[model samples]
Target chain A: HSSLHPSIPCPRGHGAQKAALVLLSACLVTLWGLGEPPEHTLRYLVLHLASLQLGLLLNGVCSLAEELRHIHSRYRGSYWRTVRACLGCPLRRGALLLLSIYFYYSLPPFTWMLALLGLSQALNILLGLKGLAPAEISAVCEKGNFNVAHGLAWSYYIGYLRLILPELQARIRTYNQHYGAVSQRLYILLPLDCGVPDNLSMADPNIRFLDKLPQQTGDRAGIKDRVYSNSIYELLENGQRAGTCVLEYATPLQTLFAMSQYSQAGFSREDRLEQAKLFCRTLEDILADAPESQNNCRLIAYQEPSFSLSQEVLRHLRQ
Target chain B: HSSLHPSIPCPRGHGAQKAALVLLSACLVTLWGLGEPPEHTLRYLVLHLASLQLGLLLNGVCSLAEELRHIHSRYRGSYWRTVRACLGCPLRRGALLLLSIYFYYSLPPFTWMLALLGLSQALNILLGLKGLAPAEISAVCEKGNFNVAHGLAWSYYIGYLRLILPELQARIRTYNQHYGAVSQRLYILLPLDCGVPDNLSMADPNIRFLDKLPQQTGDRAGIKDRVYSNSIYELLENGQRAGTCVLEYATPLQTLFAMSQYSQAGFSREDRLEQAKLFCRTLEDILADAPESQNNCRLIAYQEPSFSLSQEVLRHLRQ
Candidate 1:
């Protein structure tokens, strides 16, 4: 496989510069296609409020340069070294940076809100995609090393800052709105509304689940709320977050009703037996089995925003 | 188990209602919120969508004569049953008419798009949700009976007629700029241009697989193609269909890219797995095992979109 083919390289060192110009032209063409929608304007306003997030990411990446160098030295010159030894890898890096910058600038102006959300989503995909490549190449490849991690961290930070924050702030607003606009639950006490799932499981040794990690001391929103929910009206005024993944145009509830045909367990019964089997599994987990015999099973009995895995484990260890 | 507390009436009905409301709201809210940051609009959009869907449901119930059954049964029994049984099923039959009328009379003259889409979506959820109940209920209950199938058929039809057709017509106007005015081929004098994936399974006994469900026939989009593709696009374009389901928001290329991360084997891989599993169970019936050990495992591949499943089966069976 090593000798299968030589590394391919584009000769255009300033490809991104050229690409930027092309993108600028493309933006103009799109602008001519049709006038921007109302949503685009609103997205821009939200993005304006969340603009500080990008600045923070810039600062964070620069601060990690030293740590990155130390991590790179341990590789003892691997795929990244090979790239550096072979040709103008730095040029490619510069080109990529230029393209990213171009992309940033080329986005429709009042549409930064949509752009940032898409950026977070796209960055996640890139990071996930990179994980599938050959381990050796990914272990030390310079661009891969930096870009994947950098993108993920920044993307995650944005998610936390935007999505989570507004959620945290919501509780305060909800409480104020529902109760009275009292100056209670200020910074003096730890707000129980940390915005993370309460029943996140990590203590189970039999299985190692990896997906959305739970925030320890929070409600469903977790750190995302803490970081982004800095302002009160921001959360109450608009439900969207700058970096969080969100839907557009259609109503979520309306869409869900339509999608119920496919995703909901109700519609797929007669038509989809495979889904029925999956539904059975969920039911078995939720309702079947004796209380003492079951593992990881609990009588939820009520709707909850979050859960505690550690406490759950301690409670149900069958001691 | 039979002796246990009064058996839950599948518990799914009410819970599903709530869940459906939540998801539906999520979709609409996301759509409305999409104008802002996803999270911003999400804050109240979720509630807005949920309340709106609920209101629609309530509104449907309200429109029906309260003492409808008793009064009608005594006077116009047959007609009452005919109308009451089918007419007022909570956004099922005549509710759309009511919704349209309600919205039409409103001040700003908001298009009945919401009411139309919302009513259709609610019908879909009710039908689909009922279908997912346990077998006993699935077969016998009012939800599982005529209502679901009828609702699905009608909802599926309306989804195309109301939501998709308008969008497709709009898209067709811009097709030249987007996909480029393309060409097609004639199969035995039948013009066929739209590319649709068709897969045949001797495996699925109940349903006939129509893998060749192409989106376009020669220059025009075929009926089924028009319906399903719109479903896909509607999900993505808006984020949620009406407000119930979260759609994968990526272009077709992005879908392919996402699939690449899973396995480079592509769609063929899923086909092979299903085929192999079936073939292994009934070698002589599905794929008569030839002299060679691997004869049963022949990788049937097709590149052209116009191939017939019946022809392929005949060739495989050497009939």
Candidate 2:
């Protein structure tokens, strides 16, 4: 009987070839960034196309990285196979390509739109962070290392933006029905355009006030919000913003130039406490004995105020 | 800005390669059939191993085929990309290999086992025909092209064999325990074996007077049996012992042969009728609601006496 020889290591032959193809294609398209920005709209269009190309490149590489996880008996193989599979290999290469792309298109032409999108996506990130089931959250924090779970959470976050939200026609209908004017101009709508908690009251002292901004200048404006066609847009565009102000937030001058950029909301200490208790209790209930969320909360509470914000929200949900 | 052409047709290349490797390795071991005769003692080992391999191969091919049904739409412009999908192509090849192995080994060796184990298996085969709810008898017939419902009738058969029965063991047991052995076997055992049935006398027409064959003439016995058993040894030996004599009344000869060969019983008219019924009913039941079965049965019944026997038995059952 003839015995067939084991085939060559799969990664070196197929994985490396695929990764190289992606990298080469990405580098070829970014050559224009070395020179001064061209004046024509054609140049801007090319830049936009290039950015989309970059997004695909990132998405493709992430896909390949995902495929790596499917390899069975990952740790049992020869050292060469292990070396080829290291996550950092793709991560480093991907980061280099992204950095170069960012350098070329330093000022994204949709600068203000990108800022508001980033803000909404940030709040989405917060909600996602809060929603992590206990077992899953524990699995991430247990190693205290940047894990595949974290990367996957980010992937899911992007998919929600790129895929899921676009599919819901009701959201678009709600936006057109309630805030059609603002959305018609900006092509944007927040989740609250759906409905408010209704539980939050004007008399609540714990709620933060937007006194510094023009949108909330007087009580008279609040009393007749529905009749005032601009009320929804005005509060979001001019109210004093709070919480983390990321670099993606419009520059102060830019915010003045695009007066329709800001979005306003307040979280009171009382509500935060109620929310936190629910969050903690709910996490406890779901995980039952899971220590990871509790541990993560305890560790992050000292520095990141949002972690405490998470606790407050969860705490209320528990009740 | 370098415009990125990020149209990389994704290849699940390396991951597929790994899957193929694992699959091939599994085939090389106990799963692979070399078409050799199994140890006679192995007890349906050849059939099961072959069937299991076929099942796995079928499942894998079906899954890949189902997936490919959608591939042309999902990856429209990339012929080579679809080609690179391991599931898209290798699965068909795997299915062919599975079928080839089954026919090559399962047929020839299986014939040999039937030649040796025929009368023994046929006893159960008779019980299976009689609609006896015994596990041991039902199993051999149910191997392929057997009625699925028959499995439920054969618990005493399964209990005697202990797991030789497949599917519906509990159901078969419940039915048997509730009904008890076919009133005839119970009567025969209690009356004949225990001398109770004989107490009812020869006047009862229900008391079948089984015919005794002519005394041994040391010449050719009716050789029709060897046509079925295909055993030249038993055919010659039995012929020299009794001329034109059926073994039904040859108590001592049948007993000796049965004792020598795993205590398996000889074929009687009732046993033949029962065997015929099992072969027939199994096919009939499998084909009951299936139009394909109906069409096939007409064709099969014309050529195969087993089909007619089953139709007759099923008619009896309906009565």
Write model 1 residue lDDT over B162-243, tens digit each, in one string: 3433344334444435531211111110001112223212211222321121243222244443334411111111222121
lDDT tens digits by residue: candidate 1, A23-75: 98997788768788857855665455345444333333443443446545754
lDDT of 2 at A141: 55
What are the chain A TM-scores for all the models, listed individually? 0.18, 0.18
Writing each residue's lDDT as its tens digit, candidate 2 over B1-319 gives 1111112112123565798899879865654455544454243555555554544444444445555766679767465454445334566656655665665475446555434444443453444542445654544454553543244224322232122112223333443465412211000010111111222123222222222211122112454322111000111121231111111111222222232233123224333333333433433343344433222112122122122222322232232
- What does candidate 2's lDDT look like per residue over A120-218, in tens digits? 545544445326785555445534533322332233333322232233233334544653122211111111111212222231223332211112112
DockQ of each: 0.01, 0.00
Computed on C-alpha atoms, the DockQ of candidate 1 is 0.01
Native contacts conserved, per model: 0.00, 0.00
- True-structure Cα RMSD, model 2: 33.4
